[PDB]
């Protein structure tokens, strides 16, 4: 009897040592959207 250790990888990520690899991924980025100005949380705003 044999006992061993144990997918679809569409997402790509950048890595300094391994170059660009296929992987899932956790995005760290966002392109925010232009909105009106507001009051800064912790602080007075003049």
């Amino acid at each position, epitope marked *: 009897d044999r006992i061993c250790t144990g997918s679809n990888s569409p997402h790509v990520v950048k890595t300094a040592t391994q170059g660009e690899v296929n992987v899932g991924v956790i995005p760290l980025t966002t392109t925010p*959207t*232009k*909105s*009106h*100005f507001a009051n800064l949380k912790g602080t007075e705003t003049r």
Partner: antibody, heavy 117, light 110 residues
Framework: QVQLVQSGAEVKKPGASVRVSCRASGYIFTESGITWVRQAPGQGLEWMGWISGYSGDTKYAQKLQGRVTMTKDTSTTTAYMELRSLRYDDTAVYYC??????????????????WSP | QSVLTQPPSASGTPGQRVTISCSGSSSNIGTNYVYWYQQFPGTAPKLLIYRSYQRPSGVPDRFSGSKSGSSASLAISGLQSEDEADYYCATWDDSLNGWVFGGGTKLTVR
């Protein structure tokens, strides 16, 4: 109650100019602005421009720079739109609208609210 | 020739959900907030949806705003006779340095 009241209907020969009036009520005029939008009969809406009720700063639609002028009068809380060199394409209904933005570059980060009749 | 593209006509039997699309580009809908206005004949347009998704007070949850890339959409559910009007989308356009309007869609529910 937020009100906008305009001057009466106008009729003009081609080449003359019109000054349309817009009197404001029910909010702090000096912390808002006016935009103007016009509507050719049976057609869509065309933005004309905006003016600050705080500073008199203006920004006009590219197609109407030269021909249009907006001014405003804090005393009477009234805004005016002047259109020069009228052609037949200038036949339209002229709305004014309360615009939330009153200082900084006018860049469409804000919006306009209530429209006059 | 309008910068934003709206179908001229949209329709549905009463009670149904109809949608109105609005098709733009990177300079306008892609980078800016969308606004929706409703106009009954011979009246001022009225603000119906603001900042792409919001409802002014008075506007029922029947009206719904959507946005994806350079296109926005207005959804009217539970369609009723009093929703017969013209619907206009508007956004700022950074390329033309001014506000832009869709051609307007006429909503017919008999």
């Amino acid at each position: 109650q937020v009100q906008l009241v305009q001057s009466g209907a106008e009729v003009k020969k081609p080449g003359a100019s019109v000054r349309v009036s817009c009197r404001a009520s029910g909010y702090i005029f000096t912390e808002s602005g006016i935009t103007w939008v016009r509507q050719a009969p049976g057609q869509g809406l065309e933005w004309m421009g905006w003016i600050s009720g705080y500073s008199g700063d203006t920004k006009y639609a590219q197609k109407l720079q030269g021909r249009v002028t907006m001014t405003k009068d804090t005393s009477t809380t009234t805004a005016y739109m002047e259109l020069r060199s009228l052609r037949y394409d200038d036949t339209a209904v002229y709305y004014c609208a309360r615009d939330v933005q009153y200082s900084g570059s006018y860049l469409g980060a804000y919006y306009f609210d209530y429209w006059s009749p | 020739q309008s910068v934003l593209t709206q179908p001229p006509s949209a329709s549905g039997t009463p009670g149904q959900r109809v949608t109105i699309s609005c098709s733009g580009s990177s300079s306008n809908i892609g980078t800016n907030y969308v606004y929706w206005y409703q106009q009954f004949p011979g009246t001022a347009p009225k603000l119906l949806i603001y900042r792409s998704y919001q409802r002014p007070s008075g506007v029922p949850d029947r009206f719904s705003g959507s946005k994806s890339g350079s296109s926005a959409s207005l959804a009217i559910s539970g369609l009723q006779s009093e929703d017969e009007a013209d619907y206009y989308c508007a956004t700022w356009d950074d390329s033309l340095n001014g506000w832009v309007f869709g051609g307007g869609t006429k909503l017919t529910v008999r």
